[PDB]
Amino acid sequence: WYFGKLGRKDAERQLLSFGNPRGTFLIRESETTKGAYSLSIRDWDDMKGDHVKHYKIRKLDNGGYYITTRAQFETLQQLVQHYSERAAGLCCRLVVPCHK
Amino acid sequence: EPQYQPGENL
CB pairs under 8 A between A and B: 31
Q: How was this structure determined?
A: NMR
Strand order in the sheet with A53-56: A25-26, A38-41, A53-56
Report in angstroms the alpha-carbon separations of A86 from A6, A13, A18: 24, 26, 24
Domain residue extents for chain A: 1-100
Q: How far apart are CA A25 and CA A2, in angstroms?
A: 8
- Candidates 3.75.10.10, 3.40.50.150, 3.30.505.10, 3.30.565.10; correct CATH number of A1-100? 3.30.505.10
Q: In degrees rounded to 5, what are phi and psi of residue A11? A: -65, -50
Closest CA relative to residue A89, chosen from B1, B5, B3, B7: B7
Task: Using CB atoms within 10 Å of the CB of residue A6, give its burial: 0 to 12 exposed, 13 to 18 middle, 19+ buried.
Answer: middle
Go through chain A and tell me how many residues it has: 100
User: What kind and span of H or E run contains A9?
Assistant: helix A9-14
The rounded distance, in Å, linking the Cα atoms of A58 and B6 is 12
Residues 1-10, chain B, touching A (beta carbon < 8 A) = 2-10
Optimal mutation site among A38, A40, A42, A94, interface B, most CBs of chain B within 10 A: A38
Question: Considering CB atoms only, which of A31, A32, A53 is closest to B5?
Answer: A53
Largest CA-CA distance found in chain A, in angstroms, rounded: 40
